[PDB]
Amino acid sequence: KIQIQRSGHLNLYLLLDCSQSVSENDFLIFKESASLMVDRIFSFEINVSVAIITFASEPKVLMSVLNDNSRDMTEVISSLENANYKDHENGTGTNTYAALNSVYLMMNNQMRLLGMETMAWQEIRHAIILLTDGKSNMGGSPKTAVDHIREILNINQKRNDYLDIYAIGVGKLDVDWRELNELGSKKDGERHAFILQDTKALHQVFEHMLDVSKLTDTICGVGNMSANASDQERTPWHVTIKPKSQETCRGALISDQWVLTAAHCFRDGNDHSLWRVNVGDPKSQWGKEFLIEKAVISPGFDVFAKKNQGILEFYGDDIALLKLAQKVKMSTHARPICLPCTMEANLALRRPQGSTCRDHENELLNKQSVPAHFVALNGSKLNINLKMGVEWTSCAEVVSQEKTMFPNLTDVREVVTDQFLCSGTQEDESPCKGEAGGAVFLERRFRFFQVGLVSWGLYNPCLRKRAPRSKVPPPRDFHINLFRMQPWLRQHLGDVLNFLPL
Amino acid sequence: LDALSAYWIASHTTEERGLNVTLSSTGRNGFKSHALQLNNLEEE
Ligand SMILES: *[C@@H]1O[C@H](CO)[C@@H](O)[C@H](O)[C@H]1NC(C)=O
Numbered sequence: 001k002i003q004i005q006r007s008g009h010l011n012l013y014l015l016l017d018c019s020q021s022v023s024e025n026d027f028l029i030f031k032e033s034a035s036l037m038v039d040r041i042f043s044f045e046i047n048v049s050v051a052i053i054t055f056a057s058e059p060k061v062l063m064s065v066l067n068d069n070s071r072d073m074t075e076v077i078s079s080l081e082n083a084n085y086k087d088h089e090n091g092t093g094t095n096t097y098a099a100l101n102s103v104y105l106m107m108n109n110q111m112r113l114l115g116m117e118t119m120a121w122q123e124i125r126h127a128i129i130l131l132t133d134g135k136s137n138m139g140g141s142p143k144t145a146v147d148h149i150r151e152i153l154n155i156n157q158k159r160n161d162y163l164d165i166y167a168i169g170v171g172k173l174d175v176d177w178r179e180l181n182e183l184g185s186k187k188d189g190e191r192h193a194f195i196l197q198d199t200k201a202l203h204q205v206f207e208h209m210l211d212v213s214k215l216t217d218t219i220c221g222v223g224n225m226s227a228n229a230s231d232q233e234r235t236p237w238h239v240t241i242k243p244k245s246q247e248t249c250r251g252a253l254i255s256d257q258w259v260l261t262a263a264h265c266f267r268d269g270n271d272h273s274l275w276r277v278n279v280g281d282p283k284s285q286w287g288k289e290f291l292i293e294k295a296v297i298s299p300g301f302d303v304f305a306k307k308n309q310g311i312l313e314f315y316g317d318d319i320a321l322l323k324l325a326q327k328v329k330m331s332t333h334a335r336p337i338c339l340p341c342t343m344e345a346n347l348a349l350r351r352p353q354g355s356t357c358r359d360h361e362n363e364l365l366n367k368q369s370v371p372a373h374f375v376a377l378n379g380s381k382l383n384i385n386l387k388m389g390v391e392w393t394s395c396a397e398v399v400s401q402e403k404t405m406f407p408n409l410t411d412v413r414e415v416v417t418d419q420f421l422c423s424g425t426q427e428d429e430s431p432c433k434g435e436a437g438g439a440v441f442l443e444r445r446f447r448f449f450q451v452g453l454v455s456w457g458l459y460n461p462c463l464r465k466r467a468p469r470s471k472v473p474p475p476r477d478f479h480i481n482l483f484r485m486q487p488w489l490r491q492h493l494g495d496v497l498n499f500l501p502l
Numbered sequence: 503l504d505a506l507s508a509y510w511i512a513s514h515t516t517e518e519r520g521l522n523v524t525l526s527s528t529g530r531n532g533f534k535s536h537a538l539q540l541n542n543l544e545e546e
Pocket residue numbers: 045046047
């Protein structure tokens with residue numbers, strides 16, 4: 001399997017079959033799969049050099065790892081889309097041996113450039129992926145070239161991890177299963193030959209094609225993109241907080257020792273020594289229990305602040321801060337989620353250095369209805385839509401229909417200020433009190449960003465079991481906006497995260 | 503009495519008895535080294 005790690009350098013050599021037996025639309029499917037393939041690797045931000053070659057009767061090196069642009073995402077994707085199905089018009093046969101030999105000539109030139117005994121050639125682990133039907137018919141048996149590339153890298157039991165070869169047929173192709181087995185020789189129990197119909201099945205199999213356990217540099221937003229994986233792996237930042245009140249609230253990891261939650265979940269007081277927080281751990285599904293060094297509550301938070309106006313509960317500044325007893329051991333089940341308007345989020349967004357907080361908010365909240373997610377009690381991921389601007393007023397107009405929490409309400413903005421987001425419209429799920437304090441996060445560039453936290457809502461479905469209703473008041477949820485709380489978050493997290501300028 | 507005391511401490515005294523060795527070679531794959539403490543058994 002491909003070892004995703006910080007140590008060493010990765011080469012991916014993607015070979016594209018352009019034979020006439022493969023139709024033009026199938027080649028387009030290959031290019032789409034290749035696009036997702038190259039996007040996934042570069043999301044881990046490791047040293048990877050990518051070269052693409054197309055072959056029908058002769059190999060065409062559209063990109064070489066010897067060029068420094070092989071480490072650049074934009075140049076690689078541009079060259080990927082530069083590929084044309086008619087580039088092999090003169091020769092329409094199937095010549096896999098020529099492609100493998102081109103890979104060999106490449107490797108020989110690279111080791112000449114860097115050095116035989118130099119570590120720049122030693123550290124590198126090489127992976128080659130074939131997207132072809134496998135029905136080779138001339139040029140010679142590719143297995144001899146497969147053996148040929150082995151001695152140039154000295155492949156034996158002690159260097160098994162340095163070479164990875166895969167032959168997968170994707171699309172509406174008459175795939176020869178026997179041919180893919182020899183090229184994609186099995187190592188240990190891991191398969192190297194697969195037959196798949198579409199790019200999505202290849203997405204899943206390629207999620208199982210990566211060993212991301214090797215590195216621990218633990219950038220945010222690296223969840224898991226497989227339905228096969230556990231819920232905690234999908235949202236590693238999701239943590240569990242139980243105060244003395246015996247109620248369960250949720251939280252999100254943002255660093256190795258910092259936890260974000262809602263202020264309303266600590267009603268007994270500020271005795272943070274009595275609270276316990278559970279974080280996901282690979283060793284057990286119950287997680288690992290930690291103590292809290294210190295707690296910071298929002299000083300502007302007060303549930304009965306507006307009781308003089310008939311407002312029983314006001315969720316203004318419903319945000320709480322916690323310092324864990326010890327640093328959290330980063331793993332697949334325990335990874336932070338980066339706040340916007342931060343340099344870490346800027347790298348996660350692959351954005352230029354000169355970014356501002358308003359620009360990050362624009363990039364995230366770029367649509368009238370922005371889909372979002374929150375974690376339920378069972379760890380499941382649900383989908384909600386964020387409404388801003390003109391529709392933001394529309395989502396909040398339904399609070400005046402309430403009969404219990406606000407017996408005396410006349411002004412809508414007095415309870416739902418600019419700090420509250422919009423969710424619960426149409427078929428959107430409504431988080432309940434047990435899930436309060438959880439992360440409202442967005443997916444972009446295979447990265448997760450927490451834009452808000454669950455504070456309160458107009459409906460309580462939990463009152464594993466969920467059930468909606470169609471009676472006034474309609475379901476509606478409000479999340480504390482993290483973009484509106486930047487000053488205080490920078491006051492307490494300035495030494496933890498390098499916040500970008502406002 | 504001082505003589506017997508000094509002689510007896512000289513007779514009964516124990517050292518570390520360490521036999522640390524290092525193995526190194528230049529394989530085609532690079533250079534490697536190892537260390538084997540033997541202060542107190544046998545190691546492989
Ligand atoms: C890649 O290697 C370079 C040295 O060429 C180093 O600066 C960098 O931190 C490494 N890791 C990456 C890009 O993840």
